[PDB]
Design goal:
This is part of a larger assembly, with three copies of chain A and three copies of chain B. Chain A has 356 residues and is mainly alpha-helical. Chain A contains twelve helices and nine strands. Chain A has helices at 41-44, 79-87, 96-108, 121-132, 137-155, 183-190, 197-208, 213-216, 255-266, 282-296, 309-321, 326-329; strands at residues 17-18, 24-27, 34-36, 224-225, 228-232, 239-243, 247-248, 253-254, 351-352. In chain A, strands 1-2-3 form a three-stranded antiparallel β-sheet, with no helix packed on it. Chain A has a three-stranded antiparallel β-sheet with strand order 4-5-6, with no helix packed on it. Chain A has a two-stranded antiparallel ribbon with strand order 7-8. In chain A, helix 3 (96-108) crosses helix 5, helix 7 (197-208) runs antiparallel to helix 9 and helix 7 (197-208) crosses helix 11 (309-321). By secondary structure, chain B is an alpha+beta fold. Chain B has one domain (1-54): Orthogonal Bundle (Multidrug-efflux Transporter Regulator, Chain: A, Domain 2). In chain B, 28% of the residues lie in helices and 15% in strands. Chain B contains two helices and four strands; from the N terminus they run βααβββ. Chain B is globular. Classes of the chains: A mainly alpha (356), B alpha+beta (54). Chains in contact: A-B, A-C, A-D, B-E, B-F. Chain A binds chain C through residues 58, 68, 72, 89-91, 152-153, 155-159, 228, 230, 239-243, 245, 322-323, 325-326, 329-330, and chain C through 35, 38, 43, 55, 120-123, 125, 132-133, 167-169, 172-174, 338-345. Strand 9 of chain A pairs parallel with strand 2 of chain D, so a sheet runs across the interface. The PDB classes it as transferase, hydrolase/dna. Keywords: bacteriophage lambda, excision, site-specific recombination, Holliday junction, transferase, HYDROLASE-DNA complex. The entry is titled "Lambda excision HJ intermediate".
């Protein structure tokens, strides 16, 4: 070219130059233009050096102890962009798709821009374990699973031949979400006086019906017919009818009695509405339930319970109250694996055995 | 994991004089820069040399 | 050749390529072309000498490592021709064979005609997804399954060695055909007035007996002994005997009354005949049922229900009228395979 | 370079040391690694063939130790799987083999047999008999029975913290086996009079005892009784199996499960009329 | 959780002197700055020395 | 980990002149080949003088 080397680029990276005004500008290998970035020297070079994370521009790579096997191909950061175009055609609910994007985004700021047959299993483990040392173990499991299905679909499109991610293991969580007893229940309901009125009503309604907080904010006064409570879960899709004759003596809460309270005080189209006579979100209900938790002053071991824990407390109560098969059909749950993993205590209460 | 200027020069293809090691930092010939912490640079576990020319 | 030897090649790295502007470009022994390697002299030569020599192992008593030598094979289309012959001798219904050949013709106009040992997993996916984006999801699932079966039988003979089709993924689609109700059937029943008489009788007899439209056209009056109705299903071959006593109390249609109306109005050897008093095809009974759909003026969410939905409607009615074990013992079902009232139990 | 099998097994042990597991557990794996050392030559992992792996494996299967072959095969496989993660090799030549199915041959214990052993434990100290009745009345494991202190008993209860699983239960001091003639209360008080120590089950010197000596001395009284079985003679742990088998026909099945420390469910059934 | 003057310096890349660390605190070379409690200083968990100078 | 030109030739049986050894470098007569540090070449401890033709 006209200017191969100079006494100005002599202290600058391949991209980025310096004008006659002491200013610096970084070139663009897509049009041949540039933008002015920096007035200093050690700043423009320390800025036009991370985009420079990809001089492929000479240099190759090799760690301590390893083999060789390569040839030629294309980028990969782009594959993460084409993978998102495939997931949007798999027909997924509008909530699960977002869960995947968040993970793919973490993969972006985790692994270096690199071809696909370059990212070795060791590189994926360095990033994976990085989240484990931070405590986030449940995250590393989802990030690994997602990054695993991405390469699987990649191999099915003539790009890769192996799945290095399948080589590394996945973290094993322990679920440190403490449960909620019946005694701590009244302790929170008593401190829910400073909070709105719909909170206490939806708090008892969430323990008398044992439904999800999401479907709890979807019930209307038209879903009640002949004394039944037609509820259509959105998560699974199961359909059940809850009788308005239920009752919890362990807390002294009647089903019908609780329902009527939401018809006078609250009032509206939905069973649980706001002070403005409007339906609330599933993130605001469990939100205020937290305030009464912290304001209480009680202490636990691990992670404080939640509004969803009310569903668990509801199941444990109905167990000893009536039967076991009763606290299974009401929760809109089937199978025979979670019915037991939802009755446990997880280091809280001793499993006392009685003469029976 | 961050190392010192002495510990870093010990884990390279060829250990040179401390003077030369300090020179590379000043000339910005290592990704990423050491960043002076008090009165002694702190290399990154992945900070390798690059070398320029004209 | 034209150059043989010269300067700029005295560097020594084979497949070298030092152009006029001092720029090396390693050549590939597959196409003859080359890519820009580097701008250095002792850098590009190194990236060219390592290619010439193919290394892998490390110190041993004479290794092996193969990566060449190959011949003798066949072409896709050619093999796809005899493939159909093997299918004709597999022993299956004539209709099933047609639905397989239909997928075969799709592969022909979907994949080039080159040796079966050249088809890459990429090429296969490029064709499959080409039918997925067109809305033909369920189609790319049958074509993929049929294509994969053509390769396995190919390996069995000794043509190829690996099934590159077993690497791709089969798309999972959701049913689009809507479900018929009990209020929409009454409307369509009224819109079928402009249609022949056998249409009405066909509808009622397809919801009271819950039999397939294909077998409904094969029902003869001789298959009625005393108070039964022997119907040999053609799909699977399940034998059943429907008693002339059932009646839908949700639509007000008795099976006995329906049968008699088909003996006076129609009149023929088959319970469901035409105005000419002769058997009608299975594609005609459903085609005119459609004429009543667009005429009724009822819109659905997706794909409009068909005459087959009358069967699904028959089961969903008997399921609440009598029992569930009855519905499964009418449509021809063998084994088990919308709000459950949860009483205090 | 830096390859070889042994060199890896040394960097592999440290990896398991950070896995965060029980002490005894980590030792079990180490004993398996040492066996692999003297079972396979010292050469690169990419050189080890599936044949040599099965040659060593089957060698332990023919000797009669089929159970050991399963763990050694399951452990050696994990080493390679973690080796590939580092980028050492590319394939796990251990996933091509097949673990030998081993059937448990440790005979069970009956009521008649237990009575014959308890009486034969006369020559034995005065804590074995107490350990027997206790292990059958509580149905607990020998490991926790030695870590039981008199401070655990609270208002007619028996707080027991299982070491193996970690389950927490409380066995009331009102139980009684109706087949051998043993009472929970009468058994505990019999230990406070005879023994007399900090732990429910102590030595003649009023000091806690190891869980390896409780079942050790039990063996002596087993071979001294003169009873023949089919396979491998039952052990002290069998008292736990005999305990449940008795309580299932003494009270209920849901009681035996809660006593042992189980949570989930996991011979001659009767064909009812309905 | 708040670490002390000694505890914080005992977790840095290179442990220094107690008087040295005290100097940074006065030179605001500690981001974020420690909090006065009693007689000693309490640093933040993610507290790290920085350079407030642009040559 | 590596060995200098002198430290490598000194271990040889017939230590030749520096120039001659430097020539076996440009003629790739040494495999595994040596890498250039700054002004000197650091061969491998197992590097041998492969004399071909």
């Amino acid at each position: 070219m006209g200017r191969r080397r100079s006494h100005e680029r002599r202290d600058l990276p391949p991209n980025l130059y310096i004008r006659n005004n002491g200013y610096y500008c970084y070139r663009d290998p897509r049009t041949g233009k540039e933008f002015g970035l920096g007035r200093d020297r050690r700043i423009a070079i320390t800025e036009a050096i991370q985009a420079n994370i990809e001089l492929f521009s000479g240099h190759k790579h090799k760690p301590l102890t390893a083999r060789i096997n390569s040839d030629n191909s294309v980028t990969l950061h782009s594959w993460l962009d084409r993978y998102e175009k495939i997931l949007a055609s798999r027909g997924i609910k509008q909530k699960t798709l977002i869960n995947y994007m968040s993970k793919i985004k973490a993969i972006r700021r985790g692994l270096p821009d690199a071809p696909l047959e370059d990212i070795t299993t060791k590189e994926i483990a360095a990033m994976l374990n990085g989240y484990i040392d931070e405590g986030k173990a449940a995250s590393a499991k989802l990030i690994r699973s997602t990054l695993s299905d991405a390469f699987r679909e990649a191999i099915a499109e003539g790009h890769i031949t192996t799945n290095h991610v399948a080589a590394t293991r996945a973290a094993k969580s322990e679920v440190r979400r403490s449960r909620l007893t019946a005694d701590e229940y009244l302790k929170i309901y008593q401190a829910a006086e400073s909070s709105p009125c719909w909170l206490r009503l939806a708090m008892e309604l969430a323990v008398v019906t044992g439904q999800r907080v999401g479907d709890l904010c979807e019930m209307k006064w038209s879903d009640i017919v002949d004394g039944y409570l037609y509820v259509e879960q959105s998560k699974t899709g199961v359909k059940i009818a809850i009788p308005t004759a239920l009752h919890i003596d362990a807390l002294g809460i009647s089903m019908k009695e609780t329902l009527d309270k939401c018809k006078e005080i609250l009032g509206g189209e939905t069973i649980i509405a706001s002070t403005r006579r409007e339906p609330l979100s599933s993130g605001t209900v469990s939100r205020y339930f937290m305030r009464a938790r912290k304001a209480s002053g009680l202490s636990f071991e691990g992670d404080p319970p939640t509004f969803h824990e009310l569903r668990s407390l509801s199941a444990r109560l109905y167990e000893k109250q009536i039967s076991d098969k009763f606290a299974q059909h009401l929760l809109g749950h089937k199978s025979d694996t979670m019915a037991s993993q939802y009755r446990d205590d997880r280091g809280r209460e001793w499993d006392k055995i009685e003469i029976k | 994991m961050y190392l010192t200027l002495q510990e870093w020069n010990a884990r390279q293809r060829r250990p040179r004089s401390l003077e030369t090691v300090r020179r590379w930092v000043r000339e910005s010939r290592i990704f990423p820069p050491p960043v002076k912490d008090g009165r002694e640079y702190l290399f990154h576990e992945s900070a390798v040399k690059v070398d320029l020319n004209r």
